[PDB]
């Protein structure tokens, strides 16, 4: 495994839809998944165009192409890789499970790519359906049209943090009403809020950086994995700034439906925004450990290396935990 890349040496706004990074359509076998950011980076050649990449490639791409901040890049990438990637070959699919990530580890590890439900990916996504409904990864036109409607109603036709606050809650309530297996705890509880800020913070042309995403650009990213012509990345490193506005709009507790619709039951063992270090500890002690309960020598070493890298992305003040010793 390569070392996690450091922050950008020059984080100014600049043209990122440039001659070296043209949009190209998918070829047979090219993989796209539930993340429009990574999808767009792959479709502009910031990542390998087939959608299989190393953690270091992913971190470099999100920084270079979108000015995603280093700490957020490290945490997200190594979390995803630990639960969805191949730790021996150092390869992660940004979408469906693929033989291209190499020989699989033993069960119960799945190495399912970002499409794997319940490891990283989860319910109440904005433009992707819940896994229960049959497809957690493809762009969904009806859900996107709802995003447009919420942008018209709360953002004057643009997507901004006010729109994010209302749409986040709408998607939660729709999943409660229709998905008897709806889960909204721990890792997903956190990412579900942060992700709604990303279109406002990262898909807005960096010469403006005003938090108001137009619907032409929104469709280009969300559906076609395509930067607008002449797209400048954000003018400084960021990820989830303004997430407090989204939470404040409709504060929620972590919980799940309990095998029936309209049965949302709060989980007091879940982390929430008052316990960010617990989210990290549970992710390692429960989620990662359950995939690799008794790893053989080379897997144990790879796990420990990637867990060290994950901890570099954890907010200061948390204590590192060691599921396979020091
Ligand atoms: C740094 C590594 C990244 C990883 C591993 C990653 C992975 C993911 C995954 C797995 C999801 C699906 C979440 C779910 O259903 O629970 C997601 C959602 C999302 N990601 Fe990323 N992501 C990364 C960076 C970024 C960046 C840099 C951007 C924007 C420039 C971005 C924009 C989004 C958006 C907008 C969604 C929400 C899609 C929707 O709900 O319709 N992500 N990401
Ligand atoms: C950083 O990049 C910007 C945009 O390409 C450029 O104008 C600026 O001069 C660069 N700064 C340094 C210190 O090289
Ligand atoms: C149902 O929820 C459980 C966890 O509560 C999860 O393991 C499973 O993958 C979920 N399946 C779908 C399709 O939502
Ligand atoms: C898209 O989402 C809608 C609304 O939840 C759902 O009814 C539909 O089956 C999804 N899939 C497609 C292919 O439209
Ligand atoms: C979203 O846009 C609407 C209409 O322009 C505006 O009232 C609201 O203040 C905006 N919110 C943010 C956070 O920019
Ligand atoms: C995680 O495991 C460590 C021991 O390796 C323990 O000290 C810590 O309390 C655990 N945290 C949780 C939330 O289970
Ligand atoms: Cl940074
Ligand atoms: Mg999802």
Swiss-Prot record:
* EC number(s) given by UniProt: 1.11.2.1
Q: Which UniProt keywords apply?
A: Disulfide bond, Glycoprotein, Heme, Hydrogen peroxide, Iron, Metal-binding, Oxidoreductase, Peroxidase, Signal
Supply the Gene3D superfamilies for this chain. Answer: Chloroperoxidase-like
Q: Name one GO biological process term.
A: hydrogen peroxide catabolic process
**Record keywords: Iron included?**
yes
Give GO MF terms, alphabetically. Answer: heme binding; metal ion binding; peroxidase activity
Q: Which reaction does it catalyse?
A: RH + H2O2 = ROH + H2O
Q: Which domain of life is it from?
A: Eukaryota
Question: Cystine bridges: which residues?
Answer: 277-318
Kindly, how does the activity depend on pH for this protein? Optimum pH is 4.7 with ABTS as substrate. Optimum pH is 7.2 with benzyl alcohol as substrate, and there is another optimum at pH 6.2. Optimum pH is 7.2 with dimethoxyphenol as substrate. Optimum pH is 6.0 with naphthalene as substrate. Optimum pH is 7.0 with pyridine as substrate. Optimum pH is 7.0 with veratryl alcohol as substrate, and there is another optimum at pH 5.5.
Q: Which InterPro entries match?
A: Chloroperoxidase, Chloroperoxidase-like_sf
Describe PTMs of this protein. Answer: N-glycosylated.
- Residue sites binding heme per the record: 35
Q: Which residues are glycosylated?
A: 10, 140, 160, 181, 285
Q: What role is this protein assigned?
A: Aromatic peroxidase that oxidizes aryl alcohols into the corresponding aldehydes and then into the corresponding benzoic acids. Oxidizes toluene and naphthalene. Catalyzes the regioselective peroxide-dependent hydroxylation of propranolol and diclofenac to 5-hydroxypropranolol and 4'-hydroxydiclofenac. Catalyzes the regioselective peroxide-dependent hydroxylation of naphthalene to 1-naphthol or 2-naphthol via a naphthalene 1,2-oxide intermediate. Catalyzes the regioselective peroxide-dependent oxidation of pyridine to pyridine N-oxide. Halogenates monochlorodimedone and phenol.
Family per similarity comment: Belongs to the chloroperoxidase family.
Specify the protein name: Aromatic peroxygenase
What is the native source organism of this protein?
Cyclocybe aegerita (Black poplar mushroom)
Underlying gene: APO1
